[PDB]
Amino acid sequence: APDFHDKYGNAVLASGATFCVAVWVYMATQIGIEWNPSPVGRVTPKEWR
Amino acid sequence: STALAKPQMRGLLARRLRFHIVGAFMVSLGFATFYKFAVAEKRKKAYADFYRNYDSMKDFEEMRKAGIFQSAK
Amino acid sequence: KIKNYQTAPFDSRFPNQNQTRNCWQNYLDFHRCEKAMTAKGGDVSVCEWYRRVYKSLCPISWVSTWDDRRAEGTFPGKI
Amino acid sequence: MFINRWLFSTNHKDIGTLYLLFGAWAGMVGTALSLLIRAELGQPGTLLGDDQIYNVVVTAHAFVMIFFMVMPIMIGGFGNWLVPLMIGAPDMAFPRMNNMSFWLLPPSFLLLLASSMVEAGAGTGWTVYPPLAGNLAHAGASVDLTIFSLHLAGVSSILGAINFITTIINMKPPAMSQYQTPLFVWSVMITAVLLLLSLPVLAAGITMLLTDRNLNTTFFDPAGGGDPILYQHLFWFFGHPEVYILILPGFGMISHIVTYYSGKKEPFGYMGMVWAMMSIGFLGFIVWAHHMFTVGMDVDTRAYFTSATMIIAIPTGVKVFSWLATLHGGNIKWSPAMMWALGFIFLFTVGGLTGIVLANSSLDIVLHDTYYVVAHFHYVLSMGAVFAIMGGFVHWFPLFSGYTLNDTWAKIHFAIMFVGVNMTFFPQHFLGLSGMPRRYSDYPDAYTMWNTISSMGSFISLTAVMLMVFIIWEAFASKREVLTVDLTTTNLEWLNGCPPPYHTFEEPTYVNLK
Amino acid sequence: FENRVAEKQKLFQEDNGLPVHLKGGATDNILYRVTMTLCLGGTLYSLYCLGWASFPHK
Amino acid sequence: MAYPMQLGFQDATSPIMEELLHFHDHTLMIVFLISSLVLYIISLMLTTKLTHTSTMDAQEVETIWTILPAIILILIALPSLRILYMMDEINNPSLTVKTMGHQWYWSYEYTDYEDLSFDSYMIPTSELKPGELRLLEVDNRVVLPMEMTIRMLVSSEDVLHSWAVPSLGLKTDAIPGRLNQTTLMSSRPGLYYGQCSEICGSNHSFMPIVLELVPLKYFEKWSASML
Amino acid sequence: SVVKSEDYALPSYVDRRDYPLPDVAHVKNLSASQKALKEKEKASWSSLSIDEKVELYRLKFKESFAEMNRSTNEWKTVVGAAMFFIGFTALLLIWEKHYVYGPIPHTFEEEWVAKQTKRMLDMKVAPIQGFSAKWDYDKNEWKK
Amino acid sequence: HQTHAYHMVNPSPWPLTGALSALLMTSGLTMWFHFNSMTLLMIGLTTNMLTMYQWWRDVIRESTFQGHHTPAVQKGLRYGMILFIISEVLFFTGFFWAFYHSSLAPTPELGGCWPPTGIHPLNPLEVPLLNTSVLLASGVSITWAHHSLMEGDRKHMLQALFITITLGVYFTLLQASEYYEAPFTISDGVYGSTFFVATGFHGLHVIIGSTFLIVCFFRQLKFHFTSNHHFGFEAAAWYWHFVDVVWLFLYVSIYWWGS
Amino acid sequence: HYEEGPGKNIPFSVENKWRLLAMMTLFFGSGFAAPFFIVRHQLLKK
Amino acid sequence: HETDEEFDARWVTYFNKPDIDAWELRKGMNTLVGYDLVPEPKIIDAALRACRRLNDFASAVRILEVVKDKAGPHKEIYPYVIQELRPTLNELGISTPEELGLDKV
Amino acid sequence: ASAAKGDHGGTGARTWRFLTFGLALPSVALCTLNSWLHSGHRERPAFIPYHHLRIRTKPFSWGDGNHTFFHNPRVNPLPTGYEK
Amino acid sequence: ASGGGVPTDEEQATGLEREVMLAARKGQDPYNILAPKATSGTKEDPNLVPSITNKRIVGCICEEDNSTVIWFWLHKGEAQRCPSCGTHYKLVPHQLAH
Amino acid sequence: ITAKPAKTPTSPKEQAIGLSVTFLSFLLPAGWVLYHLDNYKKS
Ligand code: HEA
Ligand SMILES: CCCCC/C=C\C/C=C/C/C=C\C/C=C\CCCC(=O)O[C@H](COC(=O)CCCCCCCCCCCCCCCCC)COP(=O)(O)OCCN
Ligand SMILES: CCCCC/C=C/C/C=C/CCCCCCCC(=O)O[C@H](COC(=O)CCCCCCCCCCCCCCC)COP(=O)(O)OCC[N+](C)(C)C
Ligand SMILES: CCCCCC/C=C/CCCCCCCCCC(=O)O[C@H](COC(=O)CCCCCCCCCCCCCCC)COP(=O)(O)OC[C@@H](O)CO
Ligand SMILES: CCCCCCCCCCO[C@@H]1O[C@H](CO)[C@@H](O[C@H]2O[C@H](CO)[C@@H](O)[C@H](O)[C@H]2O)[C@H](O)[C@H]1O
Ligand code: CUA
Ligand SMILES: [O-][O-]
Ligand SMILES: [Cu+2]
Ligand SMILES: [Mg+2]
Ligand code: NA
Ligand code: NA
Ligand SMILES: [Zn+2]
Structure with a gap:
């Protein structure tokens, strides 16, 4: 007889995967976290003195 | 049809071990070669090339003119 | 009489990272030399080298504490 | 009856159970402190306060995880449950003294909590170095409550060590030599010798700190002719053996797990494993000053401590390769406990290798008191001692309780924790090499990205810890009672059923000499 | 002095189900009760003292 | 100083720190190789249905896995100890500078000739000038002559501290009642940063070090101006 | 058939591919017809039917090798559930950033960082490999 | 009935009272050092001596009198x-x-x-x-x-x-x-x-x-x-x-x- | 004697799974909560 | 220590013992499968005939299954062994696991 | 060494009693003689307020906080000198 | 020089201590202090395993210096064999301590 | 290992309840404290 994994395995995998990606991408980009990446290739240096 | 030939039946696990350990050893030499060329020697040459014609007084004068020093304007 | 003093040179008696006894010994040597010279009718300028060395090596607060204690009568070294 | 049984116990299983419950509770405490650390560091700036509250939290995190979680679980818990069963003994040599070893630990933990509640806590580091820890820079009762906490934990372990050594030497079947006792039994006995020799030296050092603080001695105070570095020698003379105390019982449980889930009757190279554990225990006593490479020691001394520290890799490597050779040709059972043990082998090896980097005094100048050290020791503690604990707990939970865990939940638990601990600690190598110091509540801006990832990792480990509690609850809630266990012929602790009767081996095993 | 060990061996081997720490008689129970009362009483008081030392007294 | 997303050591500013870089590259390759080998062999042991569970003879293979690690350890210890004693060598400094650690700032004393000493405190974040680095700048930098051998002497007047400058490979503990010695030689002018490296109370995180390396003539005039 | 807790000291059945012949039969009690089947097994096995042979196997053994070695879909549940709880953890991290963390220091404002970057370049931070080495002082731009 | 020679000890209160006596002596020393008071300390020293006395008494009962x-x-x-x-x-x-x-x-x-x-x-x-x-x-x-x-x-x-x-x-x-x-x-x-x-x-x-x-x-x-x-x-x-x-x-x- | 067997060799009851859940929640929850409340106690002094 | 041929002969002799009992049959097969080899047809032949003397059809089928299992991924070994045992299988009436449907998951 | 006695025929109560009364206790009696002989008070030295001595980083938890536990007025000066 | 007044074990030992003493004098080991010596271990000459109940755990060190011990319950009845080396063991149940 | 079927089965719904209660018991008191940190500090 089919067990829990035969019945619900595909759906747990698919839904867990999709939820996990969505909420980490959201947390990583949408709530103002400062990653402080490298300025190399990204920041235009500005006169400071 | 035709009979099947007798295959090797003994020491199959030991044979697989021998073959993959030698493969691990040849990969280990290949990686050390890559590492010695991509990291260690690269670092040796970046430092040597930097200092070969390095002019420390000219370096200082650039820093001084940019205004970074307390002791030197 | 050998000057152009820049800083205290390497001393083989004190070759290790811990330099506490180098500072201490030259402090004692200077004040021992000064006491000998002050009494016996001589001149402290012969003591100058020790004074330069201990001034180079010794934290200001150590000298100042040791000086205070010599004044008080409580300096535990022999001078 | 309840009081008779659980407060007045003279039974090695019940006392073992008390130690597992105590360590589990301490692990919740240590986990919360670990999250407070990573909340402070999870974004630049100041969250809780300046370095005083922060390092009270760091100090408590270390003491709780070491003395109230790992040691009571490995030694008090697994050692009391398994050691007498594994040699067919009817109990420990000193079953009533065994109970006092346990009951000294809640008082010890109360003194540590008290220290953090009075004054401004003991913000000293778990090394408690003076003068920061003396009566001028840490005036008031917190540091003394810390010292007394350690005294009680130290008495608890010293009496335990005496009990374990005596039991393992004196209470085997008369035909069984020391070279017919299982590897876990060896690992406990060697751990107990280390405890016996090392803790009295810790006790002497913290006592001298107590008297500098309260009786006007000056062991560590230069104004009296004392020396702050003397304290560091006495502490690390204990502190290096202590980390081998923290891992040796783990090594023994790993040997048993890997043998069991490979379907083998015995670990590869038994005498080599015994040799390796004794060699590690011995070399562990002659290397302590590698915690002191920047204090100002002569260069020949640094050269000696470099080389003697590095040699420990040789016996340790024999154990790692012998575990691999035990897997070789096995009928591999991919149980949750086997996953913990496999993770252990690889991730303990990584952290052992960064220990070898740190053994080089020259390089350690730059790495010492940086997060490279923090990364090293969490690979061997969060992914080493803790993985052996989790592997041992899942494997023997059915023996101790009579009930099975849900294996699928336990695999889920492993996977979450594995992601969380590596995310937490792997980036700390970079923070270390690039110069971030230890025991900082805040860091220059450049260190932001790796601190942010490291704190996110600590939250993933939190989710695994919470899930663990649920998994234990589900087991007791469903009551799936054990029926048959494989390989009992080479795993005697299972042979009296699950759970074993209160009294086992009332009639001793029969073993002849031939 | 005379050797009375045999009498004590009879007393402590009497088949009355008492644990060894109470097997000497009612004086054991009194000593037990005094000890445990002082330990439990003293522990509550240590908790009171912790609670007191946990707060500043200006 | 360290820069964002940095993986490795700060660039070397002294020959000794350059030696440590190459020695770390050498040791890290060995760490990678052994770690990888363990991971690979683990995966090998776990990927076959073939079995062999009878008793296995050990003493043959234990020779290999004791001898090869011993050799590897010697290949680490040799360059390790060469650098150790190279660091210890006599050098004849031109200048001695003392630093005393305090809760929570550093003082510096240049007393070879005049009585020059001063306090060096973190610039508070509210007072940083634009471009300046949070938690790292000080009010009075440790000005020093470049391309010269300097004796640094390190102690403390209260609890332990530790005086560190990563890009010069320097870390020397600051212990009261003790005068620890280290040597410093910068190949380049510039600004070089470090931080207190022993726990020392409430503001441990906030007592940094900044060296300002300049030509000898500038150092001499700065020194005269600081009397 | 039915295994009891109180039987732990007795030889027991196991299906293990490395222990092909366990210490006891899977089924020890036999019906009338199973008894007759065991008597017929004492004569030529060529006279046993296929069904009789399967039944003799199922008396001795519980599962066959193919059955006991079968793979499962358990990995899907494990990996999917792990990703769920890792995803749950981001919710904690969202909550923490919203309700616990205040503003980060002003040194992370875009204009501060641009000026600090110029100043780091002016002091030639890591000029050999790590930082300034990646800036082109001649073309006044980041190296390609 | 056992057929080994080792001693199964009756369940005892003295481990607990000894452990609490350790709490009372150490918190007592803290109170003496920092809160000018000897009370906790004297209680701990009393329970500690009581514990030792009864524990070793029992060892004598178990050996000399009971033969274990x-x-x-x-x-x-x-x-x-x-x-x-x-x-x-x-x-x-x-x-x-x-x-x-x-x-x-x-x-x-x-x-x-x-x-x-x-x-x-x-x-x-x-x-x-x-x-x-x-x-x-x-x-x-x-x-x-x-x-x-x-x-x-x-x-x-x-x-x-x-x-x-x-x-x-x-x-x-x-x-x-x-x-x-x-x-x-x-x-x-x-x-x-x-x-x-x-x-x-x-x-x-x-x-x-x-x-x-x-x-x-x-x-x-x-x-x-x-x-x-x-x-x-x-x-x-x-x-x-x-x-x-x-x-x-x-x-x-x-x-x-x-x- | 004492009770022997699954669920009986332990100082807490597993007879009702919901009472068990409440006991385990208080037990582990109190351990995890304690450092947060000590942090709060220390901030609320000064 | 001994040649491959001496090993196989010790094992053929073991199972051919006329009055081998059920314990000795199980002990022999359970020990044999610990080795890093798939047993030669002549060994399996002797074990199968021991099954016959013990009136144990089911263990004969199990012995065939374990030959297959010991070969691991080398899918050519088991059909070779069965090929070589076919006259014995016919003489003894031993159906293969595949003929019994016992290779179905 | 062999000290310079002998005996060793066997080891017994009688021999160890011989040693107790014939060597050990006479040794004690002789050192008791030597000590209570060189007894008597010696001139206490001039008081110098050395900073490495008479340490006080925290008051003692008894008395007035300034007296050591077995304070002897005749030979133990306070941080400020001998008692009067 | 030497009277008496100290009791002997024969006069004053009690309880299990005395039972062990007195049994040792008879050459007996009811409390399992000694390791039993093996027989040849055949079915005719099996190792005889005393017990006060109807089953006892045996540990079999199959070959001298094996570190691995093979454990199993031995039950009243027909002799059983070590699952590793086959040597024969037979339980001999009895009456009041060994 | 082999085992009996559960004597008191814990259905998916019961498990969701035990899981939720377990997490809340860790998350809510610590959340309460961290939420009110400001009140504690700038008290
Ligand atoms: C369980 C805990 C544990 C364990 C087991 C270890 C194991 C080791 N540790 Fe670690 N360590 C700590 C916990 C531990 N450590 C802690 C808590 C601290 C910081 C304390 C503090 O300051 O708070 C610390 C600090 C510490 C320092 C001080 C660094 C500094 O403060 O600047 C050093 C220096 O040598 C060190 C080295 C080692 C070494 C060489 C080992 C060796 O035992 C590891 C040996 C293992 C291997 C090498 C891997 C397996 C081997 C092979 C596969 C063979 C081939 C390998 C080679 C050929 C190299 N450790
Ligand atoms: C008569 C000969 C023997 C005398 C014994 C007298 C009492 C000592 C008891 C023994 C304890 C030993 C160590 C305690 C530390 C200090 C005591 C040193 C011995 C002593 O008694 O020192 C006295 C000072 O006592 C003082 O401070 C006061 C000390 C009182 C409080 C003790 C402090 C707490 C002890 C901590 C114990 C920790 C135990 C270890 C636990 C280890 C767990 C593994 C010396 O007197 P003084 O006036 O300074 O000089 C003499 C001038 N005429
Ligand atoms: C830091 C760098 C470190 C690098 C470390 C690298 C390790 C490399 C390891 C290589 C191992 C090579 C080992 C060779 C051992 C050979 C023993 C042997 O020769 O084999 C046998 C001895 O067996 C026995 O002990 C049992 C057989 C196996 C005995 C040895 C098993 C070792 C397995 C190790 C697996 C890898 C684990 C370590 C990897 C690091 C005898 O076999 P037979 O065929 O006669 O019996 C079969 C019966 N027939 C054939 C007659 C039918
Ligand atoms: C100022 C003081 C402050 C602190 C308080 C210290 C107080 C002093 C306590 C002194 C120690 C007293 C010990 C009494 C032990 C009596 C029990 C006993 O001795 O029991 C014996 C067993 O040994 C056993 O358990 C022996 C077990 C005894 C070990 C004791 C060792 C000393 C430990 C003391 C604690 C030290 C702490 C030091 C500081 C770090 C009984 O066996 P037998 O003698 O063979 O008799 C049997 C025959 O009759 C049969 O014919
Ligand atoms: C490091 C471990 C911690 C990880 C993160 C924890 C995740 C937080 C779980 C929720 O915790 C609750 O959060 C509410 C906010 O969502 C708080 O209510 C607070 O906020 C509400 C909304 O503003 C008000 O209604 C309430 O009265 C006020 O107490 C509440 O007290 C607190 O228990
Ligand atoms: Cu000064 Cu840390
Ligand atoms: O301690 O490593
Ligand atoms: Cu160490
Ligand atoms: Mg340090
Ligand atoms: Na922070
Ligand atoms: Na004696
Ligand atoms: Zn055997």
């Missing part, structure tokens, strides 16, 4: 006591390390010399030498006691054991007088610190060992020991030789070489 100490149980107690003494050796070892560390490298605050400037050590040929002869002599008398017990001689056992105890008491009274007469104190820098903490823990161990010998003396008076079974006396004798050997190391290191 088979040879296997005795062998275990032998190992236990040996291991306990090893742990006490390592405890003293930390205090000798402190002493050598400070005296072999005397710091400038001391005058750079040992004994420090201003310290006037005791003469090691006066009372310290007397103390040495006393403890050495007690090592000889306790050995006479041991042999008398094995030979079945009750009177000479008691006489030798009484002489041993009298010597232990003598040492303690001599040491207490030396402490009072000493012109240096525990607050006199690292000299006074190492001197009084190391000899002070040694003197505590003399008092513990003397108490243990007195217990054996009254148990002997009550005929508990047989000519072949008397492990409590053997343990007290081993502990007594340990106290003797520690003295000799103190004498040579601190009183004589450190003078």
